[PDB]
Amino acid sequence: YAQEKQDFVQHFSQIVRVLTEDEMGHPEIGDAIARLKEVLEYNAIGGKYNRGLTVVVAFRELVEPRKQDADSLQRAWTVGWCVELLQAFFLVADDIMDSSLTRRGQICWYQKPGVGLDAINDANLLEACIYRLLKLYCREQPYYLNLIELFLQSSYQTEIGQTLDLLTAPQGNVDLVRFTEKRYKSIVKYLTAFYSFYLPIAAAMYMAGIDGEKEHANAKKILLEMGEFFQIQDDYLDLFGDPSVTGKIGTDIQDNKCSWLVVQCLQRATPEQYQILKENYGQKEAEKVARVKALYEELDLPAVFLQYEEDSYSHIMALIEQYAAPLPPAVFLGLARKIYKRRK
Amino acid sequence: YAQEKQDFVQHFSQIVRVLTEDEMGHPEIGDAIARLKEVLEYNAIGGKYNRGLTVVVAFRELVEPRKQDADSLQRAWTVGWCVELLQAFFLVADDIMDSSLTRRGQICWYQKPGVGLDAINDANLLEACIYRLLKLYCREQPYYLNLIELFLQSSYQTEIGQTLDLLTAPQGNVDLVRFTEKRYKSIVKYLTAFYSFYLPIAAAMYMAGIDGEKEHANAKKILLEMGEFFQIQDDYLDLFGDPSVTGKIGTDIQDNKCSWLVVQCLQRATPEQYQILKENYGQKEAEKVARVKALYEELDLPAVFLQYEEDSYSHIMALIEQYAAPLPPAVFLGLARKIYKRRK
Numbered sequence: 022y023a024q025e026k027q028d029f030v031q032h033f034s035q036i037v038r039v040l041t042e043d044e045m046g047h048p049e050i051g052d053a054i055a056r057l058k059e060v061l062e063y064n065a066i067g068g069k070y071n072r073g074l075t076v077v078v079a080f081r082e083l084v085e086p087r088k089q090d091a092d093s094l095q096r097a098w099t100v101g102w103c104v105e106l107l108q109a110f111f112l113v114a115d116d117i118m119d120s121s122l123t124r125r126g127q128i129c130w131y132q133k134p135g136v137g138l139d140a141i142n143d144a145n146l147l148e149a150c151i152y153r154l155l156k157l158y159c160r161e162q163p164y165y166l167n168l169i170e171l172f173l174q175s176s177y178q179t180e181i182g183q184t185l186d187l188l189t190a191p192q193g194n195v196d197l198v199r200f201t202e203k204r205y206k207s208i209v210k211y212l213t214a215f216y217s218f219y220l221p222i223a224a225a226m227y228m229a230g231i232d233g234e235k236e237h238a239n240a241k242k243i244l245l246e247m248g249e250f251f252q253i254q255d256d257y258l259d260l261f262g263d264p265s266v267t268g269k270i271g272t273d274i275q276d277n278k279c280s281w282l283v284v285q286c287l288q289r290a291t292p293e294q295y296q297i298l299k300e301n302y303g304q305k306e307a308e309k310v311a312r313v314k315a316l317y318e319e320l321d322l323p324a325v326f327l328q329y330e331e332d333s334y335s336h337i338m339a340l341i342e343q344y345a346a347p348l349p350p351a352v353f354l355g356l357a358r359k360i361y362k363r364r365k
Numbered sequence: 366y367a368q369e370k371q372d373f374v375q376h377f378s379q380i381v382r383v384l385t386e387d388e389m390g391h392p393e394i395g396d397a398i399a400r401l402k403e404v405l406e407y408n409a410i411g412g413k414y415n416r417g418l419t420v421v422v423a424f425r426e427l428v429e430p431r432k433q434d435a436d437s438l439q440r441a442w443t444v445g446w447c448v449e450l451l452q453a454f455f456l457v458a459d460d461i462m463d464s465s466l467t468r469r470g471q472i473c474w475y476q477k478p479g480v481g482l483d484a485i486n487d488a489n490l491l492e493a494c495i496y497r498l499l500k501l502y503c504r505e506q507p508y509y510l511n512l513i514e515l516f517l518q519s520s521y522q523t524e525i526g527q528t529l530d531l532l533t534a535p536q537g538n539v540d541l542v543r544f545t546e547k548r549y550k551s552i553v554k555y556l557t558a559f560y561s562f563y564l565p566i567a568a569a570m571y572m573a574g575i576d577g578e579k580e581h582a583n584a585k586k587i588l589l590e591m592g593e594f595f596q597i598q599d600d601y602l603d604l605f606g607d608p609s610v611t612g613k614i615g616t617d618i619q620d621n622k623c624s625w626l627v628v629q630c631l632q633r634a635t636p637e638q639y640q641i642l643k644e645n646y647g648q649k650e651a652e653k654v655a656r657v658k659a660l661y662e663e664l665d666l667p668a669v670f671l672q673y674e675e676d677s678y679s680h681i682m683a684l685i686e687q688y689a690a691p692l693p694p695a696v697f698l699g700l701a702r703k704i705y706k707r708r709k
């Protein structure tokens with residue numbers, strides 16, 4: 022797996038080179054292009070590259086090796102990097118809105134001295150780079166428009182998910198009544214499940230020439246369920262994770278977020294425990310945040326998570342057995358293995 | 366002209382209706398859709414609608430009236446509203462980054478209590494709505510991909526212009542040496558000239574089936590020059606404009622912006638006057654901002670602007686005479702008339 026990763030990261034230098042080549046033809050925007058490189062180098066590198074690697078691995082498993090030529094394989098890891106750019110755009114913006122401190126083992130881009138809210142445009146430039154690369158490498162391809170629409174839809178989906186997340190998590194207002202299982206499943210479906218799990222497999226499918234409605238609908242049933250689990254896992258790691266491993270500091274309690282943990286807490290809270298949560302949740306005070314963590318540990322939520330993860334993996338495996346065909350089960354199995362029991 | 370405007374604004378209620386119809390099929394995202402309507406109602410309404418109206422007026426002048434059917438005309442004002450959505454996205458984001466107080470006669474969306482930096486996602490949703498409308502009304506059209514790429518390119522262009530603007534205007538740092546005419550022309554070309562003047566005429570050209578490289582290149586020569594003047598006019602109105610008319614408070618001096626006014630000031634400043642500008646520019650202090658305004662008025666920059674506007678209009682008119690053909694000169698003349706001597 023570490024060999025798959027290294028080949029993918031080795032292509033980033035050319036991705037930057039092609040995206041910052043504009044300085045030759047237009048020396049006037051030289052500084053802007055130099056800032057884009059700085060934004061690319063900081064915000065697209067450091068992660069696990071699960072989405073980008075999924076595009077590359079799913080492409081090799083869906084396309085016949087006699088068809089996988091040098092150009093065809095370059096297009097596959099360029100689209101992989103396009104998904105990594107979509108990730109970069111989403112995270113730079115989300116770290117501002119969530120008032121987060123760290124990302125991928127370093128300070129958040131907006132928290133850097135000399136950046137600040139300029140990071141909003143930087144996030145937008147990262148998004149702009151997807152369509153630049155799609156045009157430079159896939160314009161003459163039959164799946165060109167299908168990939169453009171798939172990335173556009175992925176953006177709208179996450180942004181609607183982001184609207185739901187932000188409306189359920191108001192700063193200064195107690196929203197315990199909206200923290201339900203039905204609300205949670207609606208948020209994470211749009212917010213994470215589509216771009217993190219459906220988008221990479223669907224992009225590799227369109228590139229393989231699998232554009233069928235039924236085929237895409239079947240992959241979606243598995244992948245949207247995989248995405249729900251991945252977000253539940255991220256919600257657990259925000260509180261019970263190790264920041265040296267995760268590369269980020271948790272803010273869900275301070276930010277009044279509709280975390281899977283608070284949904285589970287409210288399902289098992291006594292009237293007394295509900296007031297402890299009402300009085301201490303969604304506030305900046307360290308002592309208040311510590312009080313909520315103590316209640317989660319008291320309701321044995323880390324073990325509730327361990328049981329969920331076991332039942333969830335068995336459900337996703339049952340979904341692979343039901344809907345994988347005619348695609349190789351390894352397509353969905355490889356991604357499932359890379360996220361199950363994850364600590365990063 | 367006021368009759369052209371009223372018909373265009375009357376179509377906004379249907380634009381909202383089609384974009385917020387998702388609540389029927391998906392009641393789970395109801396609140397998110399309700400927030401999108403609130404974002405659309407606040408941020409896409411209030412302006413002069415020059416870009417949206419340009420798409421509609423240029424379409425009727427380029428397409429034969431026997432071909433202008435009910436569906437064909439609906440597609441024209443939908444693409445007009447798509448340009449107004451691109452404007453909304455840019456302004457919501459720019460008002461955060463510029464730390465502006467008002468927009469279109471009301472408080473900035475991000476300055477609204479309960480909104481704040483959530484406005485970043487709201488800006489992104491406005492951008493998402495362009496491609497939603499392009500898909501719902503122009504997917505079966507021969508110019509579909511051409512319009513998608515034209516809006517994508519318009520975004521990258523403005524965002525690169527925005528990178529240049531923000532890098533030349535650092536908070537806390539004296540950047541008088543970079544405030545040159547060559548730097549100014551580079552910023553506003555990418556930042557404003559492409560999306561505000563080229564994008565509306567080019568979209569109406571593609572819809573009329575005029576996709577020729579030479580035809581688009583010729584319109585670009587006129588329109589990019591028109592855009593340079595429009596930004597110069599906006600830079601003048603930031604200081605010498607009336608906020609009841611403009612609907613916005615100026616921040617260029619406080620924000621250390623490479624304004625056309627500071628470029629002209631530095632070209633006419635004595636060594637003594639240069640130090641007055643160096644000591645008082647780019648700071649929040651009201652007295653410091655007032656000192657810079659006094660120097661501009663002392664160098665007679667409002668009259669320097671009046672002479673520029675006269676020479677600029679004659680240059681753009683000469684460009685219409687050179688490059689309008691085979692397009693009707695009214696296409697470029699109508700837009701020129703709507704921005705020349707502007708106070709809004």
Ligand SMILES: O=P(O)(O)C(O)(Cc1cccnc1)P(=O)(O)O
Pocket residue numbers: 111112115119121179212213255259
């Ligand atoms: O990495 P983070 O900040 O923990 C997160 O997962 C980031 C994110 C951004 C956009 C879409 N989905 C997740 P969040 O939702 O704020 O918990």
Ligand SMILES: O=P(O)(O)C(O)(Cc1cccnc1)P(=O)(O)O
Pocket residue numbers: 455456459463465523556557599603
């Ligand atoms: O409306 P504003 O804020 O005066 C402006 O024109 C807004 C704007 C946003 C995006 C592109 N071009 C202009 P700016 O450049 O900040 O002076």
Ligand SMILES: C=C(C)CCOP(=O)(O)OP(=O)(O)O
Pocket residue numbers: 067068069070071108125213217251252255365
């Ligand atoms: C969808 C959510 C959970 C955001 C972060 O995802 P990752 O955990 O995949 O972050 P990176 O690997 O890209 O750094």
Ligand SMILES: C=C(C)CCOP(=O)(O)OP(=O)(O)O
Pocket residue numbers: 411412413414415452469557561595596599709
């Ligand atoms: C390109 C710049 C100068 C931003 C504002 O343009 P407008 O003056 O056209 O603003 P609205 O009419 O859309 O409100």
Ligand SMILES: [Mg+2]
Pocket residue numbers: 115116119121
């Ligand atoms: Mg976050």
Ligand SMILES: [Mg+2]
Pocket residue numbers: 115119186
């Ligand atoms: Mg978030």
Ligand SMILES: [Mg+2]
Pocket residue numbers: 255256259
């Ligand atoms: Mg999280």
Ligand SMILES: [Mg+2]
Pocket residue numbers: 459460463465
């Ligand atoms: Mg501004």
Ligand SMILES: [Mg+2]
Pocket residue numbers: 459463530
């Ligand atoms: Mg600005």
Ligand SMILES: [Mg+2]
Pocket residue numbers: 599600603
């Ligand atoms: Mg201005």
